[PDB]
């Protein structure tokens, strides 16, 4: 998973180190769209693809498979998928890669972050349930750790992936999901959320 | 051109038979081989398996023993059928096309050859979600106001809309005369099966005293309509 800016030129490497000798194929998966084959063959772009996709060449063996994308566009942003085919390699049924490359069109934007407790309605019927909602961050990658007073949460997290916001940033959901009893025992509960090194963290307690 | 489109049951209960099909316009399946591909949320790019009318046609080992790809000619149809599915199941199932290459990298005389395959028209896909959820309307809870997060002289509230099935759910806030500053977080897809989302609305700060703020949440898998006056 990598970022580069627009004009960056992006290498991919997927798939082991090749073994015998090798038509590596790699496909294009913008989100929400179909995937595409974008090389086929290690290095022959189809008819439509840019010369800006090469792929990498069969030999030297040991070689690891290799897109590379210059002159990046923000076209370019997507999951990449190499499906190797090695000669001494049985073939795959699952896709190398998955690795998401982004492209910063724009530059990073901190995570709103909206955390509401437990409604007393909640709580009348007999459930609690932390809101954290996450928006306006850039690029689309969060961490949301939940704590109780100050220890970590395991159970009850059901963080959305971000997805973007009609103005090109993301946005996420976080739920802590609680017993009433859990809620109104601990001090606080926070929602924590970390984007891009720098963490957000809103607290809310069972007094209110 | 070639167009394809998996269609098939977008739900499907544990143990069930996940059937797909790709319906192929502007070309003939004939002339190519077929693939069915997954992405399963967990893990990206599950090849299925590949038919020809040939009946060179080969399944991923992992489903091999619950996977029959099928050509319907007259139909003009590739089809996916998944006996005994479960979760793992669940994910965007693609039809695509698949062309084939040599690789010779020896000489054919001493098998230094293989046939290698690739996809160069991919439907859309279809999701495909397994799962036990019988449908579900939402438990519908306000969000009370809340100044911390927003802008002065503004507060952020919301209806939680929790625990429905399936997919959509739709939130309006004031019947829709409230468009401004609305927010509504795509669901979660629970443990539970079940998904919540948020709707968070900002406000003038001000109008906390005077202004009903109802959302309208509405889930018709359900057919329940709920509309949540949202107090301080
Ligand atoms: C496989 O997937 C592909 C690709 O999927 C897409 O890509 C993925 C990654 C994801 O983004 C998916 O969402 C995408 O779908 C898929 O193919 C796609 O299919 C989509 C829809 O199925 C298409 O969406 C359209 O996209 C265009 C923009 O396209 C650009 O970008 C595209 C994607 O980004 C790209 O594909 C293209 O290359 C391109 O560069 C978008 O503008 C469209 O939005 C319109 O349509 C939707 C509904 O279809 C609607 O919700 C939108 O609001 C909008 O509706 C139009 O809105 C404008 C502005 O409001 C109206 O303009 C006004 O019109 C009025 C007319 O008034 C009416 C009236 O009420 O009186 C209307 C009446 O019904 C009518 N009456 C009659 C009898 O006709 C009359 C009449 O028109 C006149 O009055 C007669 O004089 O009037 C006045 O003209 C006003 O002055 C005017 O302002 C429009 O009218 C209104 N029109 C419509 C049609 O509703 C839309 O979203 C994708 O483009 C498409 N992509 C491709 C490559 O095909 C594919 O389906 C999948 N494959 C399969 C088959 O499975």
């Known amino acids: 998973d990598i970022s580069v800016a627009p004009g960056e030129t992006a290498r991919i490497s997927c798939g082991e180190k090749?073994?015998?000798?090798?038509?590596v194929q790699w496909y294009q998966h913008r989100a929400g769209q179909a995937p595409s084959l974008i090389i086929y063959?290690?290095?022959?772009?189809?008819s439509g693809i840019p010369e800006r996709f090469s792929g990498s060449p069969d030999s030297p063996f040991g070689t690891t498979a290799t897109l590379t994308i210059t002159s990046v566009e923000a076209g370019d942003e997507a999951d990449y998928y190499c499906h190797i085919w090695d000669s001494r390699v049985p073939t795959k049924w699952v896709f190398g890669g998955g690795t998401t490359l982004t492209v910063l069109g724009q530059p990073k934007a901190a995570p709103s972050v909206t955390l509401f407790p437990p409604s007393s309605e909640e709580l009348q019927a007999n459930k609690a349930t932390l809101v954290c909602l996450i928006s306006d961050f850039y690029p689309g990658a969060v961490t949301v750790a939940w704590k109780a007073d100050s220890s970590p949460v395991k159970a009850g997290v059901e963080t959305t992936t971000p997805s973007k916001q009609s103005n090109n940033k993301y946005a996420a959901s976080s739920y802590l999901s609680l017993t009433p009893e859990q809620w109104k025992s601990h001090k606080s509960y926070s929602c924590q959320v970390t984007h891009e090194g720098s963490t957000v963290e809103k607290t809310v307690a069972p007094t209110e | 051109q070639m167009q394809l489109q998996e269609s098939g049951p977008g739900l499907v209960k544990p143990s069930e038979t996940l059937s797909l099909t790709c319906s192929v316009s502007?070309?003939?399946?004939?002339?190519?081989?077929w693939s069915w591909i997954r992405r399963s949320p967990g893990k990206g790019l599950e090849w299925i398996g590949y038919?020809?009318?040939?009946?060179?046609?080969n399944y991923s080992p992992s489903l091999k023993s619950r996977v029959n790809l099928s050509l319907d000619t007259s139909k003009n149809q590739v089809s996916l059928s998944l006996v005994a599915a479960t979760a793992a199941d669940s994910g965007k199932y693609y039809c695509?096309?698949?062309?084939?290459?040599?690789?010779?990298?020896?000489?054919?005389?001493?098998?230094?050859?293989?046939?290698?395959?690739?996809?160069?028209?991919w439907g859309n896909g279809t999701q495909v979600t397994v799962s036990s959820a019988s449908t579900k309307g939402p438990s519908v809870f306000p969000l009370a106001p809340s100044s911390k997060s927003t802008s002065g002289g503004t507060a952020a509230l919301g209806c939680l809309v929790k625990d429905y099935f399936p997919e959509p759910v739709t939130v309006s806030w004031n019947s829709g005369a409230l468009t401004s500053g609305v927010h509504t977080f795509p669901a979660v897809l629970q443990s539970s099966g079940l998904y919540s989302l948020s709707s968070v609305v900002t406000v003038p700060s001000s109008s906390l005293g005077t202004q009903t703020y109802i959302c309208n949440v509405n889930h018709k898998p359900s057919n329940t309509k709920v509309d949540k006056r949202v107090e301080p």
């Open positions: 502007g070309a003939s399946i004939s002339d190519s081989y």
């Open positions: 695509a096309r698949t062309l084939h290459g040599r690789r010779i990298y020896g000489i054919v005389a001493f098998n230094e050859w293989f046939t290698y395959f690739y996809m160069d028209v």
């Open positions: 038919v020809h009318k040939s009946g060179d046609t």
């Open positions: 063959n290690n290095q022959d772009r189809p």
């Open positions: 090749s073994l015998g000798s090798r038509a």
